[PDB]
Amino acid sequence: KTLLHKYSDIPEGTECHRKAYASTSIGGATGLIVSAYSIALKPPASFLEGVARTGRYTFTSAAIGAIFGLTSCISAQVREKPDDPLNYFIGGCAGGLTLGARTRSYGIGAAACAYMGLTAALVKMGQLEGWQVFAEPKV
Amino acid sequence: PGIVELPTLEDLKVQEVKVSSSVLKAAAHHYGAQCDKPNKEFMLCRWEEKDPRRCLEEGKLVNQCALDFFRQIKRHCAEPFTEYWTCIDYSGLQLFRHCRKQQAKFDECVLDKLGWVRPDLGELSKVTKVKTDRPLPENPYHSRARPEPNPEAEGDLKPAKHGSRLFFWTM
Amino acid sequence: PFFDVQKRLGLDLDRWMTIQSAEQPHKIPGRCHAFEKEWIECAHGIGGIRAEKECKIEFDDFVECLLRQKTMKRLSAIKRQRDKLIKEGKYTPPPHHLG
Amino acid sequence: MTMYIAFILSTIFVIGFVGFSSKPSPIYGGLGLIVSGGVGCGIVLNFGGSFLGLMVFLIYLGGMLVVFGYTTAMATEMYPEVWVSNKTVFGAFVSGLMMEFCMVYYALKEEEVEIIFKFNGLGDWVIYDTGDSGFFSEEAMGIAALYSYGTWLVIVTGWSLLIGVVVIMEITRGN
Amino acid sequence: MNIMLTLLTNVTLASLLVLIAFWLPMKFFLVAITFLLFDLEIALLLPLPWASQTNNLKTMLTMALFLLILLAASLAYEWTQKGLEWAE
Amino acid sequence: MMSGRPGRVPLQFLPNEARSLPPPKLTDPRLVYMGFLGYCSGLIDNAIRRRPVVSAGLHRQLLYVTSFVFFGYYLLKRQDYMYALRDHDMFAYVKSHPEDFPEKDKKTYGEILEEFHPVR
Amino acid sequence: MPLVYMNIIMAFAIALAGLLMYRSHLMSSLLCLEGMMLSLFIMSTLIILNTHFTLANMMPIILLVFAACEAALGLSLLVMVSNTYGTDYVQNLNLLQC
Amino acid sequence: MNPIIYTTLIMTVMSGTMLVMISSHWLLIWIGFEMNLLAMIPVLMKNFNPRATEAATKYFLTQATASMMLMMAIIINLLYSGQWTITKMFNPVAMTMMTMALAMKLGLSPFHFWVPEVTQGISLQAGLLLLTWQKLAPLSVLCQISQSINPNLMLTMAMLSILIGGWGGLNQTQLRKIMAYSSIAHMGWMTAVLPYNTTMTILNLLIYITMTLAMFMLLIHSSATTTLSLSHTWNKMPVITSLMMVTLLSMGGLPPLSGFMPKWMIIQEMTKNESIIMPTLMAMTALLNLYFYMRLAYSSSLTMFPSTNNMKMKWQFEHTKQMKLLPTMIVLSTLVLPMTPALSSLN
Amino acid sequence: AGRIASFLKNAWAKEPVLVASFAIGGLAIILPSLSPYTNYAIRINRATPYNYPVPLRDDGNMPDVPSHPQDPQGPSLEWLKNL
Ligand SMILES: CCCCCCCCCCCCCCCCCC(=O)OC[C@H](COP(=O)(O)OCCN)OC(=O)CCCCCCCCCCCCCCCCC
Ligand SMILES: CCCCCCCCCCCCCCCCCC(=O)OC[C@H](COP(=O)(O)OCCN)OC(=O)CCCCCCCCCCCCCCCCC
């Protein structure tokens, strides 16, 4: 989880350039994973078409992370409140707008803001209270 | 993890036997049946102590006792011994079945000049009650302490209090 | 096993081979029989959780025995330092290293 | 040279694996593994595994792969291929040896290869153990225990191989 | 030392012998699979000569015939149910 | 979990020490439920065979009911046994390590303050 | 972990990659399937022969006797698909689409 | 297949799987897996149709390598530990190799891709053995080595199993394909708690086996393989369709039906281990299973699809198969929920 | 018995091969039990030593083990000599 540590180590509301670049890396990293699978299960055309598919998938995933990290961090600076879960929501769903921008669909962009923002808010709660998704066997 | 202290070079100068394999194996049985006293407790040291370093004192004695046996032949029928061991080497397996006549010549000589009888079949392959002075090691493997086992389960069985106790199920 | 039928029946099916400190053909020892005896005797009736922390010194000594790793790190740096100290011409190897 | 015989055999093992796993024409692919089986014996022999290595020469290397060579005779493509015939197989061959070549370079420099497992690049001879084997030939008496200590392994080997013959002729029965 | 040296010189002479003479001038599959199974079962009883020197040869005795019986049994099935009789 | 407990003989459905517990009462409500389960199987059986569900083959239903009640009974003995076994070593464990279950210092409500929250 | 151990497991790793990189020939994949059990045999033998685990010499042969048994059925499986398709090409091994 | 040979071949699979659960040696665990693999291929090739050969080829190609991958972590664990006893793995990468190797023998993660088609290609009875008896042998190993498996790897693969299994069932027609996707979803359910508690994994196994075996081999009684074909069965045997809906609703897990037995107990254990987001999403995607469960019940008994005139012929005849152990198997797979304390018996 | 003896001779006429091997396997599997020498074979096999007969410390009252390799006490394989 080197990339995950790269993001979470940066304190909220500061070093926005580092937080953005970390956001691009995490968004970029998941771009390769989804594109490599897409090439595998669905065989593309000649290699230039394959990388064209790979480029599109990586571009959106990196773009969703890029803007999300920017706005999630500057919001803490501007609003002077890093702890609020809304600080991730306002940028967490803007990634859905970015997805809609690269897919050219108002409906899918708006719906993605409905969902991604909620999940991005939920991630902030997870770090705050101490939520664990893959909890170790305790009992 | 510590020190690997081992004996110096001082005690590692024994009068090493300068013979070869054929002459070693030509006698063999007679040497085994006449120098068992330093062989048995040294080998017993090798097994009980489980460490070469602690059996250096017995290690030199067996080599030294070999010389007394070996030079005893030189003051005796060593010429038949030379003819024997110079016929064993010629065989690639160093086998006795092709040198029976010299086997007799060595045996008949050693039978009366010294008296070392030929060890009968299976006599050497025998566990022996070798007398020894050293006490047995308290832990040959130098084992450390042992973890205390978990407390033993006991007590007469009692009915599960209030039954299954799983959600609303009773009895 | 899931259904340890060996324990109920009492007949040995594969336990003879499970470790190399059991009986072996004509008493041939394993390369690490001594450490197996120590680790196994250390960890019995202790459970699979307690033994992994308590009987660790025995395991560490044993886990080194099979694939001797730390001691080559000992040997590798011996070779590295010896090579460096002879390449520039300071340490002269003794004749016992040769004929 | 002579001191690196297990190392040199091991790297020929890899290049043989790279060549045949790159999937050339199947009859040529068999050869790529046959030499790998050939140099595989040397590693086993050099470590005292005289019987096990030689055993692999009779079965498998001189055995089952003959059937593989047999199978590629009647059930073959009309145009069997070669590393020149296709470009991807040519690229795979170069990639495998380059990856191997870059790896031994890493092994020879610092001997501190950490990829997946932690390896040491020292000489192959160090792992050997010093001590006489008496007269019993360790390996030879180890697999001779097949009938003294084998027990369960014997019946399951017999049964599965016997079950190996009910399955075969049944599937190639032609309805 | 001597083993691979012997292999090396044998290869060189054989390779030269052609070069000096080159520059200077379902049934078949079915039996093969049965061969593979029998040849593989043969690998089981190969270490028999050393196995005949154990201290419990009784267990060695009965189980050795068990492999040979099963080779006989596997042959028997492949025999009667047409099988080894080649397809037409 | 309690696989690996000291003394658990493998593949023993009912360990001998389980007999120290009170055996299930003859008409156990748990036991008679398996009698209901057996009865339904007989009723369902005739349905697939296209037979009078309530009247066809009283021999078939009798075997169905008897087997379910019987197999339930031993399963019901191991039922309470494991729960008794689970509670047994539990009760002894709290005594062997008193440090982790300390005395809960009982204090009446006259001491503890509960903050009141208006409901308007 | 010496180099001789490394070259074998790495050979297994590249053998594993080629096995699941099916080209247009099932025989080649079956051949690349052939790699690991030999790599497994070699890897097992060095471990067992080195450590003088006398009884464990069982398993190298035990590994080979059954790991070749799939090859017994696999080849007949290959000839079976080549008796209906007339070709070991794997692109036609997709009739189970729906 | 001559019945004597067919009976022996199933016995070998019976023996091969039984060997795994009774073995204490890592080799012997791999030993029976190979025998079990060696014996099923002829069973799958029961009709010798080209589709059956396709299914057998896919199953062999995805299982033989798993046994080969199985052996790989065995020697690596042997290399770093030196013991073949079935215990915790003392080397991390070996068990990382192990969990993937065992799972792809089974198929939960993308490894699962072979399960759908292979079930479809083979016969309905052959599909039963692959889907109700082949899930015990890998689970037997996972139960024994559950002490130290990496929780992150196992739970992720369990998530993907129920998420991919439920999602693919919605867009499936052949009842064999819905069976595979339903099984994939349930396998993640039973293996999700595997790192946490082993008893409720075996609980799910007995519960899942009973309903799956009952409703598979009841579907054999209907002699149907498509939703339309299953739809027609209401006119011939409306009792069969009525029983079909009961197990289908049990299959989803609606109380008080016994199919809610695993889903309830799993959520209880994961909650006990402070893992609470994990069950909720785990429970949520179970609705996907219910949807195509409910869709099949819609076309089976809850409505009446049009029949055919030629089907009046079938009314004059009757089935000949004796539905061995079928009738009792619905009863203990849809009504055994009040017998919930039986969990302790499995311990 | 007449037909069985006829059948065995019936076998030998139309085939001499597998009847001979069936006979060979039949005897080779049954004589092992009916043997006065298989006990000698295991006795001979164990008699041959491959390892050093590790001596035991003499704590007194050892009745049968010898102190000298030529001492009469201990196991003797003279039964092999005349064998
Ligand atoms: C706080 C730390 C993190 C900070 C940064 C924020 C997280 C990283 C950035 C956001 C990641 C999640 C959002 C989705 C990313 C991938 C989007 C993508 O691939 O879009 C392309 C495509 C959508 O279009 P498509 O479905 O292909 O249809 C049109 C085809 N012409 O879709 C595809 O091709 C793929 C299929 C659809 C998407 C499937 C799910 C992908 C995401 C999985 C979860 C990733 C979670 C990452 C964060 C947590 C873990 C680190
Ligand atoms: C938990 C939630 C609910 C779960 C269950 C829900 C079930 C219904 C769900 C909807 C199903 C789909 C829609 C309806 C489908 C109907 C299926 C069918 O086959 O219907 C027609 C069929 C005709 O009847 P037939 O098969 O001839 O049998 C008559 C009785 N011999 O009818 C039948 O085959 C029905 C046969 C019914 C047999 C009833 C037997 C009653 C036995 C009573 C025993 C009383 C004992 C009393 C003891 C007292 C002392 C203790």
UniProtKB/TrEMBL annotation, chain A:
<keyword id="KW-0830">Ubiquinone</keyword>
<keyword id="KW-0472">Membrane</keyword>
<keyword id="KW-1133">Transmembrane helix</keyword>
<feature type="disulfide bond">
    <location>
        <begin position="93"/>
        <end position="113"/>
    </location>
</feature>
<dbReference type="InterPro" id="IPR039205">
    <property type="entry name" value="NDUFA11"/>
</dbReference>
<dbReference type="Pfam" id="PF02466">
    <property type="entry name" value="Tim17"/>
</dbReference>
<protein>
    <recommendedName>
        <fullName>NADH dehydrogenase [ubiquinone] 1 alpha subcomplex subunit 11</fullName>
    </recommendedName>
</protein>
<comment type="similarity">
    <text>Belongs to the complex I NDUFA11 subunit family.</text>
</comment>
<dbReference type="GO" id="GO:0005743">
    <property type="term" value="C:mitochondrial inner membrane"/>
</dbReference>
<dbReference type="GO" id="GO:0006120">
    <property type="term" value="P:mitochondrial electron transport, NADH to ubiquinone"/>
</dbReference>
<keyword id="KW-0812">Transmembrane</keyword>
<feature type="disulfide bond">
    <location>
        <begin position="16"/>
        <end position="73"/>
    </location>
</feature>
UniProtKB/TrEMBL annotation, chain B:
<keyword id="KW-0249">Electron transport</keyword>
<protein>
    <recommendedName>
        <fullName>NADH dehydrogenase [ubiquinone] 1 alpha subcomplex subunit 8</fullName>
    </recommendedName>
</protein>
<comment type="similarity">
    <text>Belongs to the complex I NDUFA8 subunit family.</text>
</comment>
<feature type="disulfide bond">
    <location>
        <begin position="77"/>
        <end position="109"/>
    </location>
</feature>
<comment type="function">
    <text>Accessory subunit of the mitochondrial membrane respiratory chain NADH dehydrogenase (Complex I), that is believed not to be involved in catalysis. Complex I functions in the transfer of electrons from NADH to the respiratory chain. The immediate electron acceptor for the enzyme is believed to be ubiquinone.</text>
</comment>
<feature type="compositionally biased region" description="Basic and acidic residues">
    <location>
        <begin position="145"/>
        <end position="159"/>
    </location>
</feature>
<dbReference type="GO" id="GO:0005758">
    <property type="term" value="C:mitochondrial intermembrane space"/>
</dbReference>
<feature type="disulfide bond">
    <location>
        <begin position="87"/>
        <end position="99"/>
    </location>
</feature>
<comment type="subunit">
    <text>Complex I is composed of 45 different subunits.</text>
</comment>
<keyword id="KW-0496">Mitochondrion</keyword>
<keyword id="KW-0677">Repeat</keyword>
<keyword id="KW-0679">Respiratory chain</keyword>
Automatic annotation (TrEMBL), chain F:
<keyword id="KW-0472">Membrane</keyword>
<keyword id="KW-0679">Respiratory chain</keyword>
<protein>
    <recommendedName>
        <fullName>NADH dehydrogenase [ubiquinone] 1 subunit C2</fullName>
    </recommendedName>
</protein>
<keyword id="KW-0249">Electron transport</keyword>
<dbReference type="GO" id="GO:0045271">
    <property type="term" value="C:respiratory chain complex I"/>
</dbReference>
<dbReference type="Pfam" id="PF06374">
    <property type="entry name" value="NDUF_C2"/>
</dbReference>
<dbReference type="InterPro" id="IPR009423">
    <property type="entry name" value="NDUC2"/>
</dbReference>
<comment type="function">
    <text>Accessory subunit of the mitochondrial membrane respiratory chain NADH dehydrogenase (Complex I), that is believed not to be involved in catalysis. Complex I functions in the transfer of electrons from NADH to the respiratory chain. The immediate electron acceptor for the enzyme is believed to be ubiquinone.</text>
</comment>
<keyword id="KW-0999">Mitochondrion inner membrane</keyword>
<dbReference type="GO" id="GO:0005743">
    <property type="term" value="C:mitochondrial inner membrane"/>
</dbReference>
<keyword id="KW-0830">Ubiquinone</keyword>
<keyword id="KW-0812">Transmembrane</keyword>
Automatic annotation (TrEMBL), chain I:
<keyword id="KW-0472">Membrane</keyword>
<dbReference type="InterPro" id="IPR026626">
    <property type="entry name" value="NDUFA3"/>
</dbReference>
<feature type="transmembrane region" description="Helical">
    <location>
        <begin position="17"/>
        <end position="37"/>
    </location>
</feature>
<dbReference type="Pfam" id="PF14987">
    <property type="entry name" value="NADHdh_A3"/>
</dbReference>
<comment type="similarity">
    <text>Belongs to the complex I NDUFA3 subunit family.</text>
</comment>
<keyword id="KW-0813">Transport</keyword>
<dbReference type="GO" id="GO:0005743">
    <property type="term" value="C:mitochondrial inner membrane"/>
</dbReference>
<keyword id="KW-0812">Transmembrane</keyword>
<dbReference type="GO" id="GO:0045271">
    <property type="term" value="C:respiratory chain complex I"/>
</dbReference>
<keyword id="KW-0679">Respiratory chain</keyword>
<protein>
    <recommendedName>
        <fullName>NADH dehydrogenase [ubiquinone] 1 alpha subcomplex subunit 3</fullName>
    </recommendedName>
</protein>
<feature type="region of interest" description="Disordered">
    <location>
        <begin position="55"/>
        <end position="83"/>
    </location>
</feature>
